[PDB]
Design a protein around this nucleic acid. Structure first.
Ligand SMILES: Nc1ncnc2c1ncn2[C@@H]1O[C@H](COP(=O)(O)OP(=O)(O)NP(=O)(O)O)[C@@H](O)[C@H]1O
Ligand SMILES: [Mg+2]
Ligand SMILES: [Zn+2]
Lengths: 421, 151, 392
DNA sequence: CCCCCCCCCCACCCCCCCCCCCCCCCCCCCCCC
DNA sequence: GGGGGGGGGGGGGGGGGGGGGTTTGGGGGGGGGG
C-alpha cells in the first residue's frame, strides 16, 4: 500500500501547490511565510480542502490517524520545494486545521466519535508543564549493537520485542543523542457552563497538543478545539478505556483596533463613557463604578535600581447594606475584566485559594495546581460575601494580596508562585 | 563475564609478612614479651575478646625499622587507605600465631570444640584411606583499629 | 541563555545556561564508577567501570550496579574499597524565577545533576545560573511494560558549572588607614551619636532607638562565676508599636550592619520530613546566632510551643531538648532584637504592651529594653517621607 | 451555659517456577548353553 | 532350566524461557472562653 500512500501524499502536494482563490496561491504563500519566520507548520481550512477535492476530505475524515501524517509529509516536501534550491534540514511540519463543522458539545462525545475528527468547545481549566515526545528514535541492540530507527507519528509504537537480526530476549535501547523530540502539553477542557444539564456536575476532558499548539492557551480561556476524539489504555472497570482528544487546532493587537483604541483614547468624554459602561443596568453608585474602572485599568507596576518591585494592582472593598448591588457589580467585573476569577467567601478553602497539591492521573506523579489567586494573576479576583470567609483563609489571602506571592512547601515540593492580582 | 585487571603499588604477601613481623616483635619500648603476643595469651585464656590495635604502635614499629635501616612500606598509610582488607590480614596473622591457653577453661563445654573435634575424628577416619572449618567460626575475638594521636 | 520555562525540546543535547532558583536539593550520595578487586588466588587486581545515563554525555550500554565476585577462572574476588573510585552525586531542582513567569502560569522547573566538586555549591532558595548539557534519559514509555505511551521522556541538565547569583565581608580586612581612623575617631566624644546615627540614615528621629541598637551590637560581657556559675552578658531588645513605623526598616539596617546575624519573621526542635525515616535535631535562629544576633520581626505572631521555650534563651542563653531520648542542652548565647505589632487595631498608647499584644508580661519583661514606637502624624515628617516616596 | 474552636481519623536484574527433551536404567522376553 | 543380552518403556535430571517484584476536606467529639 506504499504506492497508495505515495498517491495520497502527491494528492496533498498538489493541493498545496494548486489551490488558489482570487489569483493568490494562499497555501504556497502561507507555507513560505511560515518558513521565513521559522515556524514549521501550516494552518489549513478544511472548507478549502472540501472545495478542492472532496475525495481527499473523505479520506481524511474516514481515518485521520493514518491520513494526517501523510498530509504533514506532503507539507514537508512542498516546503523544501519552495524554500531550497535542491541540486545546487527542516523538521516534520505540523498540520493545523481550521473548521466550521457543527460542534459536538463536550458531554455528547461518546463511543461513536472514536478516531473521528471532532470540533468542540469549553473552558481550559488546567495546562500541564511541557513534556518531550520522540519523533525520531535512534535505536541500538544491547548485545550485537545492530542499529535501527523508529520514525514516529504522534497520533496512535514501542521498541521492537527482539533483535531484528542468541541476541538476548528484549534487547533494544535508545541513543538519546541522535534521537529527535518535540514539545507535548496536556490540557483539561471543561464544558461550557451554560451548556451543563440541569442539576449536573460539569464534565471535562483531558487532551493533548504538540509543536506550535503548546503554550497557546492559559487556564480560564474559552476555546473551540478541533481534534481527534481518541482512546488510551490507562492503568486505572473492565475492558474500559480513557477518552481524550488529540488537538489539531485551537481558536480562543489587530492593525485597525490599534486605530479604534487611538480614536477612543482621543475622545474627551472617555471616563464618563466607561463609567456608564460598567454594570449599565445598575442605577447610581457613580463613584463606585468610577473606582471599578480604576481597579480594572490598574496603576503602573514599577521596578527600582535595587531590584525591588512595586504594586500596580488596586484592591477595592465594597462593604455595605443588603441589596445594594455589590454581588451584581462583582459578577459584572468577572465578565468585563480580561482575566478574572469569581469566588464566594464561604465557598473558599485556603488550598483552593492559593495553590494545592495534585497527583496527575496520566503520569501518576505529584504536581502543584493553582488556586483562585493564581488563576486571577494578571487580573481581578472577585471575592463575594467576603465577610463569611474563615480566618485561616483570610490569613492565606495576605501574602497573595500584598506580597503578591504564594510560598509553598507541600509534598516536599518547595515552590513560590506569583499573584499579581 | 570477563574482567580486565591492572597492576597496583601494593603486595598483600609482603604486607602480611610485615603485619605478622609487627605482631610477634613489637612492644611499647619507650615506656621502659611483645604487647600483642601477651594480649593474645589473654585472648587464649578466654579472659579478653576486644583485640585493639593502635596505629601509634604501628607508627612506632615503622620508625624503629626505619631507624634500623629497613623500609617498613608505611603500613599506617595502607591501613588508613584500605582498612577493611587489613582486618582480614591482621586476623589471619593472629590465627596463625596465637599461643595456647594457660588458664584452664573446661574446654569441652564449648559446642564448637565438641563439633570440630568430632569433624576432626571423622576426617581421621577418612584419612586412613578406608581447611577443617572456615576460620571466622573458630575466631572468638573481635579486632579493631584505634586511630593515630596528634603528632 | 535560558530559564526552565523557555528551555524547550528543541534544545536537547545542546549546551545551555539556565537562570533560576534552587529547590529540592537531594542528599549527597556516593556513586560507584570504578570497582577494584583483589583476586584471592590469582593475585591480580581485577576491576570494572560503570556507566549510566548521567555519568556520560553520550549514550553507552548501562552497567548495572553489580560487583563481580568471580574470576574467569572461577577464583573468588575481594572488593577493594579506597582503591575503588566513587564520585559524589547530587540532584537539585532549579525553579524558574517567579518574576519572569507570565500572567496566570506556574513556574516551570528542571533537575540539574551535579558530580564531585560542583556538589553543594548551592542550597535551597539560592538564585543561581547553571550551565550544562540538556538531556533526555530513560525509556519514555517506549518499553513494552507501559501501556500508556503519552508520558514524556524524563529530562535533565548535566551540570558543568554552578554560578550562585549572590549579587544582582563577615570579618573585614583592616588597613593602616582603618586602624588610624578608628582610633582617632574613638577619642572624639560624639561617637555614640555619630555611629548610632549612621545606622538607618533614612529614618526620621528615633535617636534613642539607634543608640540602644548600637549598645546591643556592642553588647555586654559574659560572667562565669566560681564553679562555672553562668550569668548572661548578652542584651535583648523589643520594639513594640504601630505598623508602618521605622521598626521593620530598622531590622533591615541592623541585619545588614551586624555580623553573624539571623533573619526571622526559633529555639531548637526534633524534626522529621517526607523522605526521612528518622528524626533529626534542628537549630533555631538563636542557636544559629550563638554569640551572634537574632532579628525577629512580627514577634507577636510566635506560637505557644515557641514562647514557652523562649524563657530558656532569655534566662539561661541555652535551649533544652526533651524527646526521643536526645535529652541534652544547646548553646544559644545570642543578643536578640525583636519587633511586634498590635493584635487588633492601631496601638493604644494608654494600654500596656501586655494588653495591646497577646505576649505575656512574664515574657515581655525578659528584654533588657522595651520600646514602644508610634506613627506620629507630624507634618514635617509626613512632608519629608511623602516626597521621598513620590521620588521613588 | 452555649457556642466556637481544634483536634482526630479516615481515604532491570535475579529467583522462583514450570515445561520440555534426552538419556539411562530396569524390566521382560528370547535365545543359548 | 537358568542366565545373558537385546529391546522398549518410564522416570529423572538438566537446561531454557518467563514473569514478578501525602495533602485536603469533612464530620463529630471534646474542651475552653464570653
Ligand atoms: N441600584 C440598583 N439598580 C438596579 N438593580 C439593583 C440596584 N440595587 C439592587 N438591585 C437589584 O437587587 C439585587 C441586588 O443583589 P446583590 O447584588 O446581591 O446585592 P448585594 O449588594 O450583594 N446585597 P447582599 O448579597 O445581601 O450583600 C439584584 O437582583 C439587582 O438587580
Ligand atoms: Mg451580595
Ligand atoms: Zn542484536
Amino acid at each position: 500500500n506504499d504506492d497508495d500512500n505515495t498517491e495520497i501524499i502527491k494528492s496533498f502536494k498538489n493541493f498545496i501547490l494548486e489551490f488558489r482563490l482570487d489569483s493568490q496561491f494562499i497555501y504556497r504563500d502561507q507555507l513560505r511565510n511560515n518558513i521565513l519566520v521559522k515556524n514549521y507548520s501550516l494552518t489549513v481550512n478544511m472548507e478549502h480542502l472540501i472545495g478542492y477535492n472532496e475525495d481527499i476530505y473523505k479520506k481524511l475524515s474516514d481515518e485521520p490517524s493514518d491520513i494526517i501524517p501523510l498530509f504533514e509529509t506532503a507539507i514537508t516536501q512542498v516546503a523544501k520545494r519552495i524554500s531550497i534550491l535542491s541540486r545546487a534540514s527542516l523538521p516534520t511540519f505540523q498540520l493545523i486545521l481550521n473548521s466550521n463543522a457543527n460542534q459536538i458539545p463536550l458531554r455528547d462525545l461518546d463511543s461513536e466519535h472514536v478516531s473521528k475528527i471532532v470540533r468542540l468547545s469549553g473552558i481550559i481549566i488546567s495546562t500541564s508543564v511541557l513534556s518531550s515526545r520522540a519523533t525520531y528514535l535512534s535505536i541500538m541492540c544491547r548485545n550485537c549493537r545492530h542499529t535501527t530507527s523508529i520514525t514516529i507519528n504522534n497520533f496512535n509504537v514501542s521498541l521492537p520485542r527482539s533483535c531484528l537480526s542468541n541476541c538476548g530476549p528484549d534487547p533494544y535501547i535508545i541513543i538519546h543523542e541522535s534521537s529527535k523530540f518535540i514539545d507535548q502539553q496536556f490540557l483539561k477542557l471543561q464544558e461550557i457552563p451554560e451548556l451543563v444539564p440541569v442539576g449536573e456536575m460539569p464534565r471535562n476532558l483531558t487532551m493533548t497538543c504538540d509543536r506550535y499548539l503548546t503554550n497557546k492557551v492559559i487556564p480560564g480561556t474559552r476555546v473551540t478545539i478541533v481534534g481527534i476524539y481518541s482512546i488510551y489504555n490507562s492503568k486505572n472497570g473492565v475492558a474500559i478505556r480513557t477518552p481524550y482528544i488529540k488537538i489539531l487546532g485551537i481558536q480562543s493587537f489587530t492593525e485597525e483596533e490599534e486605530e479604534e483604541f487611538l480614536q477612543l483614547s482621543r475622545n474627551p468624554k472617555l471616563y464618563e463613557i466607561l463609567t456608564n459602561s460598567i454594570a449599565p443596568s445598575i442605577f447610581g453608585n457613580e463613584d463606585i463604578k468610577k473606582a471599578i474602572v480604576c481597579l480594572l485599568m490598574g496603576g503602573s507596576k514599577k521596578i527600582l535600581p535595587d531590584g525591588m518591585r512595586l504594586r500596580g494592582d488596586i484592591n477595592v472593598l465594597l462593604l455595605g447594606d443588603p441589596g445594594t448591588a455589590k454581588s451584581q457589580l462583582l459578577k459584572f467585573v468577572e465578565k468585563v475584566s480580561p482575566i478574572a476569577v469569581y469566588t464566594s467567601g464561604k465557598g473558599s478553602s485556603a488550598a483552593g485559594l492559593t495553590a494545592s497539591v495534585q497527583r496527575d492521573p496520566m503520569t501518576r506523579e505529584f504536581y502543584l495546581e493553582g488556586g483562585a489567586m493564581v488563576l486571577a494573576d494578571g487580573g481581578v479576583v472577585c471575592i463575594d460575601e467576603f465577610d463569611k470567609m474563615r480566618d485561616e483563609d483570610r490569613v492565606a489571602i495576605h501574602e497573595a494580596m500584598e506580597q503578591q506571592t504564594i510560598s509553598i512547601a507541600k509534598a516536599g515540593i518547595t515552590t513560590v508562585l506569583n499573584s499579581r492580582t | 563475564a570477563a574482567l580486565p585487571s591492572i597492576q597496583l603499588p601494593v603486595d598483600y604477601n609482603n604486607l602480611f609478612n610485615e603485619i605478622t613481623d609487627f605482631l610477634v616483635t613489637f612492644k611499647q619500648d619507650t615506656l621502659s614479651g611483645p604487647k600483642y603476643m601477651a594480649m593474645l595469651q589473654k585472648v587464649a585464656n578466654r579472659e579478653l575478646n576486644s583485640v585493639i590495635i593502635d596505629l601509634d604502635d604501628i607508627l612506632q614499629y615503622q620508625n624503629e625499622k626505619f631507624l634500623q635501616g629497613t623500609q617498613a612500606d608505611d603500613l599506617v598509610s595502607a591501613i588508613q587507605q584500605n582498612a577493611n582488607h587489613f582486618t582480614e590480614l591482621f586476623c589471619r596473622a593472629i590465627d596463625n600465631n596465637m599461643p595456647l591457653p594457660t588458664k584452664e577453661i573446661d574446654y569441652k563445654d564449648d559446642v564448637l570444640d565438641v563439633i570440630l573435634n568430632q569433624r576432626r575424628l571423622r576426617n581421621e577416619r577418612m584419612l586412613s584411606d578406608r581447611e577443617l572449618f572456615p576460620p571466622n567460626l573458630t575466631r572468638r575475638y573481635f579486632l579493631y583499629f584505634k586511630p593515630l594521636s596528634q603528632n | 541563555a535560558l530559564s526552565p520555562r523557555t528551555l524547550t525540546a528543541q534544545h536537547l543535547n545542546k549546551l545551555v545556561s539556565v537562570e533560576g532558583i534552587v529547590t529540592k536539593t537531594s542528599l549527597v550520595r556516593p556513586k560507584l564508577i570504578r570497582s577494584v578487586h583483589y583476586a584471592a588466588k590469582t593475585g591480580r587486581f581485577h576491576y570494572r567501570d560503570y556507566t549510566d545515563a548521567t555519568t556520560t554525555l553520550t549514550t553507552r550500554i548501562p552497567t548495572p550496579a553489580i560487583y563481580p565476585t568471580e574470576d574467569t577462572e572461577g577464583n573468588k574476588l575481594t572488593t577493594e574499597y579506597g582503591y575503588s573510585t566513587f564520585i559524589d552525586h547530587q540532584r537539585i531542582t532549579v525553579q524558574e524565577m517567579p518574576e519572569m513567569a507570565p500572567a496566570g502560569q506556574l513556574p516551570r522547573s528542571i533537575d540539574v545533576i551535579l558530580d564531585d566538586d560542583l556538589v553543594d555549591k548551592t542550597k535551597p532558595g539560592d538564585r543561581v545560573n547553571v550551565v550544562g548539557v540538556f538531556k533526555s534519559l530513560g525509556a519514555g514509555g517506549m518499553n513494552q511494560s507501559n501501556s500508556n505511551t503519552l508520558i514524556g521522556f524524563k529530562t535533565l541538565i548535566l551540570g558543568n558549572t554552578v554560578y550562585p547569583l549572590h549579587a544582582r565581608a563577615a570579618r573585614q580586612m583592616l588597613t593602616d588607614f582603618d586602624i588610624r581612623n578608628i582610633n582617632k575617631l574613638s577619642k572624639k566624644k560624639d561617637i555614640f551619636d555619630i555611629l548610632s546615627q549612621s545606622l538607618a540614615p533614612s529614618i526620621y528621629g528615633h535617636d534613642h532607638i539607634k543608640k540602644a541598637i548600637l549598645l546591643m551590637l556592642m553588647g555586654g560581657v559574659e560572667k562565669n562565676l566560681e564553679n562555672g556559675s553562668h550569668l548572661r552578658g548578652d542584651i535583648n531588645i523589643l520594639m513594640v508599636g504601630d505598623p508602618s513605623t521605622a521598626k521593620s526598616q530598622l531590622l533591615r539596617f541592623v541585619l545588614n550592619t551586624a555580623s553573624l546575624a539571623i533573619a526571622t519573621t526559633l529555639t531548637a526542635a526534633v524534626t522529621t520530613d517526607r523522605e526521612t525515616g528518622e528524626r533529626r535535631l534542628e537549630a533555631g535562629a538563636m542557636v544559629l546566632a550563638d554569640r551572634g544576633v537574632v532579628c525577629i520581626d512580627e514577634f507577636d505572631k510566635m506560637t505557644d510551643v515557641d514562647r514557652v521555650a523562649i524563657h530558656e534563651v532569655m534566662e539561661q542563653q541555652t535551649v533544652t531538648i526533651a524527646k526521643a531520648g536526645i535529652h541534652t542542652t544547646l548553646n544559644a548565647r545570642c543578643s536578640v532584637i525583636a519587633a511586634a505589632n498590635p493584635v487588633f487595631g492601631q496601638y493604644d498608647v494608654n494600654r500596656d504592651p501586655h494588653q495591646n499584644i497577646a505576649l505575656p508580661d512574664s515574657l515581655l519583661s525578659r528584654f533588657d529594653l522595651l520600646f514602644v514606637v508610634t506613627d506620629d502624624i507630624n507634618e514635617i515628617r509626613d512632608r519629608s517621607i511623602s516626597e521621598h516616596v513620590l521620588r521613588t
